[PDB]
Design a protein around this nucleic acid. Sequence first.
RNA 1: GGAAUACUGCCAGCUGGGACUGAGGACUGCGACGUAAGUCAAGGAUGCUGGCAUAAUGGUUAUAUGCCGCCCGUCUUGAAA
RNA 2: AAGCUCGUAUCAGUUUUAUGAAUGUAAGAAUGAAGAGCUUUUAGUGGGCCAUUUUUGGUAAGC
RNA 3: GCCCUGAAAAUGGAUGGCGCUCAAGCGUGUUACCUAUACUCUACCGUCAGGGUUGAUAUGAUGCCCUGACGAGUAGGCAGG
Lengths: 27, 106, 68, 197, 170, 151, 49
Amino acid sequence: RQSRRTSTKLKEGIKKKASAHRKKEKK
Amino acid sequence: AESHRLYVKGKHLSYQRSKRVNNPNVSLIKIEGVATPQDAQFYLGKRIAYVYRASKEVRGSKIRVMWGKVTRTHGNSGVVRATFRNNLPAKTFGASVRIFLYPSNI
Amino acid sequence: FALPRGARTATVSKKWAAAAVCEKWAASSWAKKIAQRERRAALTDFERFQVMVLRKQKRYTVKKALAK
Amino acid sequence: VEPVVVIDGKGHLVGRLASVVAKQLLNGQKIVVVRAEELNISGEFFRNKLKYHDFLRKATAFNKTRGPFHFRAPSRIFYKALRGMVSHKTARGKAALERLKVFEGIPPPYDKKKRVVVPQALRVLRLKPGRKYTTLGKLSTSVGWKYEDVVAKLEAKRKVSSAEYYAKKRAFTKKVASANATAAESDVAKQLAALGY
Amino acid sequence: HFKEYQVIGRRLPTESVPEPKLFRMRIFASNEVIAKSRYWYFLQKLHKVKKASGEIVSINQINEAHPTKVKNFGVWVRYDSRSGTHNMYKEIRDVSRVAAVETLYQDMAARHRARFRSIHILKVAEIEKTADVKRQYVKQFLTKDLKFPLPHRVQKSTKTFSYKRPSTFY
Amino acid sequence: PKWYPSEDVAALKKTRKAARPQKLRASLVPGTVLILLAGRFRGKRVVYLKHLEDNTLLISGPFKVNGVPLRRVNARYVIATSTKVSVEGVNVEKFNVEYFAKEEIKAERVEDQKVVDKALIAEIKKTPLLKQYLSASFSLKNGDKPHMLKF
Amino acid sequence: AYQKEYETAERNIIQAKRDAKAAGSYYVEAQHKLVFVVRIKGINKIPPK
RNA sequence: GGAAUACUGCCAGCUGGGACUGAGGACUGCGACGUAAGUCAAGGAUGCUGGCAUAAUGGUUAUAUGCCGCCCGUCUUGAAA
RNA sequence: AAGCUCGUAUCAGUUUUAUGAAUGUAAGAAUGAAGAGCUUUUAGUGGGCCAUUUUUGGUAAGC
RNA sequence: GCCCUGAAAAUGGAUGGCGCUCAAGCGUGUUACCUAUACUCUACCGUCAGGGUUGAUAUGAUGCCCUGACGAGUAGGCAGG
C-alpha cells in the first residue's frame, strides 16, 4: 500500500517544481 | 425530604487553553441542561463551590470547599468560564461543581 | 384543506375559515401537548406546589382502586 | 442525569458512537456499551474486512508477539476504536477507559435495566437511506471471533425471558391507564389539568 | 446573500463631446461597492475603458416585483473555467429574481467549481407560459396536483441521550 | 482630636461620592413571598415586610408558620416569588436598624413577633394552601433548570 | 449654527436626489473629499516603498 | 387607491445582567442642577455590615494531575550538524 | 562621544505637476518630522544561503 | 465537475492518530465561537523627553514633584550598583 503523508522535502519540492513551471511559461 | 439541593450540578471540564498552552486561572464548567450562551447568561456571576472530602479533619469536618464565580460564557454549548480563589486542581477535571443561586437577579 | 394553486392571503383566510382548522387543530392530542408544554412552563413556584399537593391526593384515590 | 448510562450499539456507527462515548468519559461519565456485535459501520462488508486485515498484517517484526495485538472480539474492536480518542497513556486517559465497559450481548446486571441510544449516531438517521453498511457480527467472525453463536443463542434466551417480562408489565399498566382513566374526570383531577398535569 | 443593482456609466464628458452613451446593466452583488467594482470589469470586456476614465452615474437597488409568487427563471450565463470560457443556460423555479441568481451561484460552484469572479450573468427572464420550459427537473413540478412525501425524516436532537429509539414516519 | 498628630499622615482628597438610596429590583413589593438562598434559614418561604436603612429587607416567616423570626436579610440572597399577600394590615414602622443591636432570647423581641404574626396569619388563611406552602421547604428537583423556571 | 448646517446639507442632497427622478434628470453625487484610513497589517514583512 | 412592514442608517433614546479596576491623597480647575441657599454621577471609591487570639490567615517541603520544557560550553560552516 | 552654529523651513526608500530621450531637473505641490548640518576622534565589522523580480545562455530535463 | 484506470515492489505504516460516507470528504455561502508576548484600556517598573519648585518647601534642589512617549538584541559602546 501507498501513503498519504507528504514528506516535507516533497511538500516543498513541489513548490520548487511549481516555481519552475512559472518561469517556463513566461519564456 | 428527598432534596435539600439549592444548586445546579455542573462538571469541571478544563482550564481554558489552546492546543498547547493552558491557563489554569480560567476553569471551564459545563452546567446541567444549559445548551446555549443565552441560557447561560442567567448563571453569570453566581457563586460556585467545588466540594470534596479530605483525609484530615480541620474545623470539625473532613469536608472542604473552594469558592468562585461564573464569569462569562464559552463557545455555544453553554460551557461557561469560571474563576476560583485558589485555582481548581486539574486532577479534578471532570468532577462535580455545585453552582448556586445567590446572587439573584431574580 | 381545499386550496387552489398559488392562492392569495385573503383567499387562504377564506378557505381556512371555511375548513375552520384551528378548532380541528386544537382538538388533536398534538396541539394539546404543545399547550401542555407551554402551560406547565408558566407555573408559579406556589402554583407548582399546589400541583404536588393535588398529585398527593389523586394518588391516594388511585392506589385505592387497585389491589381489588 | 444518571450515574450509569448503559448505552447500546445495536444500529450505531462504530465511529461516532465512539467519539461521544468518549468525550463522556473524559467529562467523567460512567458508560457501558452493550450488544457490541450489533454495532455497525459504513461501507460494504468486503471493506471493513479490508480496512482491517491490513490493520492485521501490521504486527511486529523481530518479535511478532510484542506488537500491535489484533483483537477479534467485537467489544474490543470497538474499544480500540475509542481508546483511540482519549490521550490514553496519561492518568486522565487511563482514568477513563477506566470508566468504560463494552460487553457483547447484554449480560447481567444490565439485562435487567433500561438502556438507550445516541441519536447523533444510528445507521437509520445518518446513512443516506439505502447505502452499503457493514454489521460487525460478520465482520468480527470473518476474522476470528469464535462465538458469534453463543452470543446469538445464549441470546434469543434473553429476548425471551424478557418480552415475557414485558407482557406482565403491559398487562399491569393497562390496568392503571384504566384506573386513572376512570378515577379521572373527578374534580381534583380537573383542577390539575388547569395547571396541566 | 444577494441584491440587484441598476448601474449607469458614461466616460466623463470631454470637450466637444457632451453627454456620451450611458451603459445600463443590472448587477447582482452582495453590496453597492462590489456592484460598482464588478461594473467596471464588465465595461472592460464590452469595450476599451478604465475605472478612472469613466464615472458611475447612478447606482440604484431593484426589489422584486411580486415576492409572494413563484415564477420560473430562464438564465443565460457566461462563465470561465480551466479551459476557455463558454456560454450556458439553465432554468430555475423560484420566488425572486434575486434568490434565483443566488441559488444558481451555489449550483455553479457545486458542479463547475466556478466562483463569483468568473461568472457573468447574461440575462435572467421569467418564462410566462409553460412548454417554453426546456428542462426536465423544472417540468417535473409543472404537473396538475403534485402530492408527494418526504420519507426518512431526520429529527435533530439537542440532547445526546435518547430513550425512545427514534422512529422516522412523517 | 485635641492630640496633635505625632506622625505625618497626609489627609485624604475631598471625595466625591454621595450615598444614594438603593433601588430594588422590580419584583419586590412589600408582602411578597421569598425563598432564602443562604443562611440558617436557607430554603425557606418567607414574607417580605419592609425595605430598610441599611439596604436590607425585614422579613418574617412568620415564626408561627415555618420557624423564621423577625429577621433582616440581604436583597441578593433571596428569590422573589410572584405570590403576594396583604401586608397593609401590619404595623412595621417600629423596626429600623437600631432594633437590631446586641452590645437567653429577649422577652421584648418575642412580644413583637406575636403582634406581627397574628396580624398576618389572618391574611394567609384567606388563600388556599398558603399556610401549608409556607411551612414547606423549597428545593430543586431533577429537571428543574432554573433559567427556565418561573418564580 | 453647525447643527443647522449639517442637517440642511443632507436635506438638500435628499431633495436634489428627489428632484432628478421627478424631472427625469440624473443627480451627480458630490465627490467624496475626506477619507479615514486604518492600518490593517502588522509591522513585519512590509516592503520598503 | 391607501397604509404598513422588513432592510439600511441615526439618536448628545430609555431600561437591565456579568466580569476587571479604584491609580491618586487638604483646597484651587472645567461644569451641571437650584430663584437662592447650596447640592452633584464635575481634576481617579466611598458608605454599611460580618468573620478572629487554642485565631484569621500565610508559608515551607514532599509528591500528585494538566500543559509546556532536545545537554551545558566551545569552535567551524549559510544555519541543523 | 565632545565642541560650534542652529531649531529650523533642515529634509524624506513617498505621491503629484512641470520639463527631455521604467527613467533625469524644479515647485508660491501634498503629507510627515522641531532630532539638522559642520568640526574632532573611536570601538566592532570584509559570513553566505533562500525567496522575489527583470533577464542572458540553455536540452530529455534540471537549471 | 466528481469517481475508477491513468504501474511500484520489497523489516509492519500512517489525511498526525482514531476514525469519517444526506461526512468529520469536495465546491460554495451565511452566521456563531476558540486563541498569541498582536491591538485597546488601567496599574506598576525603568529609561528618555518636556517642565515646576527660594524673601525656601510639614524629607538630602546631587531633594520633592507634574506631563507624555517608549521598552527584542550578538560584536561593541555607555552608565548605575
